[PDB]
């Protein structure tokens, strides 16, 4: 009965948490880029793309929200609490993973913006750190997809 409400709430949380995490990471990276621009403006665009990389987390959250929305329909089946609660849990897990990854990526980018300016040879290390951080987001997306798969009971 309330399973559709639980699923809708879970999808909303999955969208909102990922959006907030991506926004925080992007804001931190933008502040770092603005600080670094006055020193070596030639390198302002050399790290702007990893700064805006929070769009990846935003898109992942949007995809998770769309997937959660797709799976809820009375016509297909009168899904019970076992389905709505599962969808809500999958959405919440995906959103929390996205928010954590976004915050970590924002901090890492804030560090790397100054690090690359101080040492151009550290760009590869910063990229490696960013990829290691985004591994968590990839794992979270995989877990969310796996959890949402079983929700179609």
């Amino acid at each position: 009965e309330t399973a559709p409400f639980f699923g809708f709430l879970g999808a909303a949380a999955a969208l909102v948490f990922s959006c907030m995490g991506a926004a925080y990471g992007t804001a931190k990276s933008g502040v770092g880029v603005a600080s670094m621009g006055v020193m070596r403006p030639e390198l302002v665009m050399k790290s702007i793309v990893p700064v805006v990389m929070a769009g990846v987390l935003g898109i992942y959250g949007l995809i998770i929200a769309v997937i959660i929305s797709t799976g809820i329909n009375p016509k297909a089946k009168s899904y019970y609490l076992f389905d709505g609660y599962a969808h809500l849990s999958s959405g919440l897990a995906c959103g929390l993973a996205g928010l954590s990854a976004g915050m970590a990526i924002g901090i890492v980018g804030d560090a790397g913006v100054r690090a690359n300016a101080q040492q151009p040879k550290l760009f590869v290390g910063m990229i490696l750190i960013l990829i290691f951080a985004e591994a968590l987001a990839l794992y979270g997306l995989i877990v969310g997809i796996i959890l949402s798969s079983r929700a179609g009971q």
Partner: protein
Amino acid sequence: AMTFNIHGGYLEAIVRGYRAGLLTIVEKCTLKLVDEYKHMLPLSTFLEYITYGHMIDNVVLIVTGRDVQELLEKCHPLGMFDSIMRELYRLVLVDTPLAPYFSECITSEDLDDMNIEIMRNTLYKAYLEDFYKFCQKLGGATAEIMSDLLAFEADRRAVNITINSIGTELTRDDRRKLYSLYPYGHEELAVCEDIDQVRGVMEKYPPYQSIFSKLSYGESQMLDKAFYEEEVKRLCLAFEQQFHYGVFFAYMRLREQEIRNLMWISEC
């Protein structure tokens, strides 16, 4: 504890690396250290207070005039920043922590800041105000170091007053009224008119005990050198610099001490 990783970690690592790398040559080293400090730009307030430390002396020196134009030659950005004679003093009262208090405490301008002794009194008052402002920003282990430095300055001023400045109206009352455990128990130094009396007063603090020793050196100098030299000798404690703590002030002090040692080297 997690706030250090949340913010300030990269700056702390850079400062630690610069300090670990540390060890007209003196002027060149001072300029390099000042450039390193400036390029580093929560911790902003700490950096502002650290700069204001020497900026108080820089502003006191600039307050002259009387060959005032020569102050541009010593425009070291570490302490002689442009942002940090009552008419000009009111203008200079901004952008400094101790300036608003000194505006009222030293409202006599040159009358209370005569270059013979009263200028030193105004400088000591400004240093006391800056030390109070720094101690106000409590929350870290640097409070003990700041208290030790302020105590050393106050005790050195009291020793200088009792030695010869007593005739310059630096009496027992002036040992704390004008001469910047000391914030609570400085009254013991008001009667330490002799070197033996100075050692006896130092006996009230067992850590300060045996620091004076024969008092042939360190305490022999006037102004703020008597107990400040004790802090310089004991600065090996500052050399500890435990991690995950505010060590920017410690690094600045170490760089200043290294510059002073290089200057004292000179022609061997």
